[PDB]
A paper describes a structure:
pmcβ-l-Arabinofuranosidases hydrolyze β-l-arabinofuranosyl units from arabino-oligosaccharides (AOS), complex pectic dietary glycans, and plant-derived glycoproteins such as solanaceous lectins. We recently reported that both Bacteroides thetaiotaomicronBtGH146 and Bifidobacterium longum HypBA1 are inhibited by β-l-arabinofuranosyl cyclophellitol epoxide, supporting the action of a zinc-coordinated cysteine as a catalytic nucleophile, where in most retaining GH families, an aspartate or glutamate is employed. These findings are accompanied by X-ray structural analysis of the unmodified β-l-arabinofuranosyl cyclophellitol aziridine in complex with both isozymes, which were shown to react by nucleophilic opening of the aziridine, at the pseudoanomeric carbon, by the active site cysteine nucleophile to form a stable thioether bond.
In order to gain structural insights into the reactivity of aziridine 2 with rHypBA1 and rBtGH146, it was cocrystallized with both enzymes, and the resulting complexes were studied by X-ray diffraction. In particular, the primary hydroxyl O5 in 2 was involved in H-bond interactions with distinct H-bond acceptor residues within the binding pocket—these are E217 in rBtGH146:2 and H142 in rHypBA1:2. In the rBtGH146:2 complex, N1 of 2 interacts exclusively with a proximal glutamine (Q689) in the active site.
Author numbering:
A (entry chain B): 22 to 491, 497 to 506, 512 to 802
B (entry chain A): 22 to 491, 497 to 802
Write the structure that this text describes.
Amino acid sequence: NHQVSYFSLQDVKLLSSPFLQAQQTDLHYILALDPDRLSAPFLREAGLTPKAPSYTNWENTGLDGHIGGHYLSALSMMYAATGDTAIYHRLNYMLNELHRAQQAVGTGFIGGTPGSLQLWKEIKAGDIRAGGFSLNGKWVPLYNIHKTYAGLRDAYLYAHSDLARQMLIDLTDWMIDITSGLSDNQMQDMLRSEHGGLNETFADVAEITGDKKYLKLARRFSHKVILDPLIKNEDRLNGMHANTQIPKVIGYKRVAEVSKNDKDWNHAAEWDHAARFFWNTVVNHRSVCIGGNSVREHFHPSDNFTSMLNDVQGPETCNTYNMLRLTKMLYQNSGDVDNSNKPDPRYVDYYERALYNHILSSQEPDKGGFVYFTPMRPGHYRVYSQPETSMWCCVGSGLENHTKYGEFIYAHQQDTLYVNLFIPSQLNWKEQGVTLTQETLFPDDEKVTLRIDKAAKKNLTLMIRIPEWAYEITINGKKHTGASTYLPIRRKWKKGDMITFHLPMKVSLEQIPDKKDYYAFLYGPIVLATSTGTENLDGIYADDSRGGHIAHGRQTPLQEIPMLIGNPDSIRHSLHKLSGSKLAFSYDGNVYPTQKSKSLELIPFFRLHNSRYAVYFRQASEEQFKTIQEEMATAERKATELANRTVDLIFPGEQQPESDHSIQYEASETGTHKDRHFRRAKGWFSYNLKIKEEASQLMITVRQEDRNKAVILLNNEKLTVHPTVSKADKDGFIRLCYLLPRKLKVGSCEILFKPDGTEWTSAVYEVRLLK
Amino acid sequence: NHQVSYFSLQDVKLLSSPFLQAQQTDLHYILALDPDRLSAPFLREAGLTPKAPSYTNWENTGLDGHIGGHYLSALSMMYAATGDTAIYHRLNYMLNELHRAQQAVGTGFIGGTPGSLQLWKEIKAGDIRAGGFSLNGKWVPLYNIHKTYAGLRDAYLYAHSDLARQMLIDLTDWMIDITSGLSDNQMQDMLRSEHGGLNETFADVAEITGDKKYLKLARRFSHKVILDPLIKNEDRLNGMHANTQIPKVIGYKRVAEVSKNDKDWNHAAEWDHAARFFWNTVVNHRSVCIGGNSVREHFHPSDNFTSMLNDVQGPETCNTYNMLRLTKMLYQNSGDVDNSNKPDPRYVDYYERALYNHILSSQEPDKGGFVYFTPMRPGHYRVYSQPETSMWCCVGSGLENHTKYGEFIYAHQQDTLYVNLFIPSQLNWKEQGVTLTQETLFPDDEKVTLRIDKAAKKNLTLMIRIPEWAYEITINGKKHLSDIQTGASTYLPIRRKWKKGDMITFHLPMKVSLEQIPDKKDYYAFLYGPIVLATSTGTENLDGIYADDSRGGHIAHGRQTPLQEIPMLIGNPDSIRHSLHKLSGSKLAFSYDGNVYPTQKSKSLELIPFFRLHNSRYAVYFRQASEEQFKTIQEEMATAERKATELANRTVDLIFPGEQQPESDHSIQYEASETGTHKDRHFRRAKGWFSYNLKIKEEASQLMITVRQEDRNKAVILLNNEKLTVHPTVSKADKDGFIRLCYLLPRKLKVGSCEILFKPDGTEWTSAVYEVRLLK
Ligand SMILES: *[C@@H]1[C@@H](N)[C@@H](CO)[C@H](O)[C@H]1O
Ligand SMILES: OC[C@H]1[C@H](O)[C@@H](O)[C@H]2N[C@@H]12
Ligand SMILES: [Zn+2]
Ligand SMILES: [Zn+2]
């Protein structure tokens, strides 16, 4: 049939490696969560009495119920991988509690969003008030319920719960009823609010049941404004919130898989193609070396990574989790597209890069804790979640990440096995009566062995992946380019057979994709990093506060971080492998400033924890050293000085900064000009500024040619002091700097913008509070 | 300072090669033109008495003066390359005649457009009536005068005429005065009419004079509706006339070069970036293997090359000429963008591909004659211009093309020479006291030798381009292996104290590749190294292969061959690729020794370089099929494609409303009319009326009009003012909603001309008409 299939997690057992460690640490974190707290939002909205308070953080500020969704997925997948009894009891319990909630309402509805029944009543009637991250005064409710749809799906598919299947079908039938009276225009209006991968889950329900009404529902939930450009090979992603988009694209691809033999619809190949193009543009133009994307959750321009190297909010972990889910889908049928009937190993090159360097790095391996933002800025650190405090999106996906490292190691195609990832594992290839063990100390050693533990004397082809970054193969003791490919080995495999091969690894120096003067060291597919200090690791284990996912500690000026001096080729050659069982390197070349520790020590980024770090280093030629150092010593130092005086910061029109500052508005809009986001209002808009130290100054950014004006109120007191207008920057933005008449005291403070004798407010692009 | 510079044409002498042949053939064609005929439009509009009638064709049907513009450029550049005295005398004469015209009016105006003074008076006052290809009833006058601006610039920069400089400044100052009373809105409205690269030329005048007012004028003449998407990495080019857009983008890039140190404007990198993105999208998504783009002069969708493989109007030559000018600009500062101080050789990969396969193929090498359209349809031919008859845009650019093959062979950067094209040449590198000779029989042999003929004992780096499609070199007998640095295109540095008598030998390994049509339909062309190969498929019905002066004589109107009669490659692409084998002899020649249908009874299919294939029908792209799918593919081609060919071979005349050249060729008139696109097809309609003259070479029985089915607006049809009242036979609607109305005429239209006029039939608009076809 040529169909490539994936193994279930039951049939791929992880052996001793960093991936098994990560699985076991995640198991401990999953088991630390209290199911009564995660179920509490659901019971409340069903009119039942909760057994415990919900979690705080996002679980009581509008996204109540989203972690419960992920919890079902993570439980279900971890159960499939491990067979853990404690997990089993938790999953059974959680499913039954949500079942009680579903019975109490009796329509199929399950949800945690505060005032859910009121919300979905409004929507069914055609009262749809959508913003980018809001629907009828609620925080991304469609995104929220998607995690339940996905959770119940996963409980059926991975854990074999018939109860979950029935719960999922009732919940999907419920949404058919909610949307039965809405036009396509109304649907697409509603889908302007972030809605996760609802279209994926509804396509999943179509495959599970075999009923095309769910496939009709999936297409109605496919957001057209994103899809239509991607069909025509157009990247319009600049300025967009990135994690919003990737689950839609997963969705479009899934609709195409499940619609492959629908006679009444002929748009499958188009939707498939659109997803392939999306993957192409994000991976090859918008991704850093660790495999992630986005800055402050948003796609910056692909010709300008300045913000990637300057902002502490580097790639979000959810985005990579989702990019890997998309990768898995695209690889599966990649042979059908090019008509080779052979899947494309370049998808695996990316899978490996992102899994080893971003997913594996995003969990603290001993204590546990999940990362939201991984700064690519040289010399900052990343913040970890804690079980009871942190209810972020990146916790949710974090719980899922480490359950399923077995999922992409192999793939099967009739009589053919693809050996894709070099991860110690035992495979049960039941369809050919084969058991197989892969052993390797990779990435700390080059050798891989594949032992046939059991076989039924049938002719089978092992397709061994030969990566870009890597041909002698020893079969049964018998000894026997430059492109992602596969080496076929066909034998009547019997018990005791042994395939030995080596993966040659080299140092590369990989430039930031827009070709600015920044480079990271890699060894094979492993991103290396240096530890730059352990000072001011503020909130490294997060509390439950809004914005506790961000690394808010002191910003170090870039001139204090090691800068690589010379030509890239000699820089690359000056990194030297140290001896020992683990990957470790020293950079022994020209550096600025002087290194007191003699030389720079680099290790795999996935092992660098509880520390500030550089992955990308600033580079400078000897010719350009003077002017580069002047820029870093003056302009960059002052920008760091500004950040270290900053007490609070809001980016209007960016959903999480606004959500974190308790955005309220009346008759308001958001948008983009010159790659910066803004909000404005005909009515008003407001935030709560959170003030850890006393503040002397407020600093508002507008465009100079915007002739609309704004009154500013601070706790209802009108600010009448005249701003110090700065010179307009290249793109037409000016800062208004207001010396406040009294200091804002430690605590909270409302800032409100309403129009000053014009229709709109000024479009505000930044709100910053300074000492 | 690590800036890359180009050599002047005076310092790069072409040696014996196909490029020198092409230069010398173009010289003969340039000298065949009568300067009194080319100057006649200019003298007329100045109120002077011409010494001869203007040329016919486009020189008396609205674009009068456009070839005179190009003539100045071609003369100037050919003078620089050759030092030919006859060229010098022609240029001097032409400049003086246009100077007399400029003096007679005395405002700075020089132009050939009929009623020029009246036109520019209207425009200065703010009476602007712009269409896509018209301004105040005149055919692309801004495009026309651009050729004069460019011609005078070239006479200064290449030939060192101070008179041309002064004429250029007066003409630019004249346009400052014309546009001094117009708002930005009015400018941008006027720029909806095709205007060539006026913004480029005005930026050129800014650099020549050093006065920023010309740079301000250049930005005012930059069309924003095209620029603004390109700044944001958005390709919206589908449906657009392609040669209209590329000179604007050249313009935007040139404004960025000349604005590099302007403190009062900070948009240079944006405009530079927009041009780089444009180059990227056209080359990597919209270009065929010969390096060209467009079908019927327009950008089709990049996921659908069906029209590229069906239509006799393949890539236009002007587009590649212009793409190569943009390439040269982008390569020059490419090292500054990535801050490597090393220019990007992938620009050269394209330059080579387009130069060898499109530009070099577009001139008949012995007789002369320039090509307008190069069909990628399997089994058609291309039409050549003739000196006295053909005044097309592609003649104008054609005259320029072959003057300047010396321009991109090398580049220099202080102590570094880039050896980019493998073209026999003698280089005068005055800046390092070096004379150098490149000798090679490439593409017919792999060996290149570089001889140092003169040097001043300085350490200098020769950067030898190593193309994608291609490491042992030899300096003075001694062989020197270096590591194969990458599969990708790169430069090999060789640094010595070069002295007289030194010799660098290297080889360029060439392989057969099989390049698929970019949308991945089952069509492939053979290449050997960067050379596109082709097979000759016959010499039947080469109608108008040397064009007369008629409207539409640029198109290859001969009988279309059914695709089933053309060789189809049978088997998997890998085996197809391996089955092409090099024949012996000094010249590139191949036989395809694999499976072909229809079958070859006598000899294998013979493939040669497309640039040597002339006076013949050809295939570059072949249809491909597996052995499993062979039967059903042949059955499909024997019905549907055959019938489409049968229709075309019955066709006596054809018009595509809303496409500028078909309409212009059929004498478009209208009142209260609009054009536009639906489902990738162009249309015109009117509240007043619109009309054409149908040209009828043989007697015609039938008229066939295409509309959308759901358009409820209707049209009366008049043929020479007699109303056509016969009922059309309505065809079934195709997939995109289009129906053909087929009218059996009551009498045959006789051989000659005939007006067709559409006015509304009891509705506000006419029906939107997408095709008008006259059949026997
Ligand atoms: C040919 C010619 N008609 C010119 C002006 O309209 C166009 O640019 C080219 O396509
Ligand atoms: O809005 C819900 C999620 C979003 O997908 C991600 O970027 C983070 N903001 C949360
Ligand atoms: Zn997240
Ligand atoms: Zn042309």
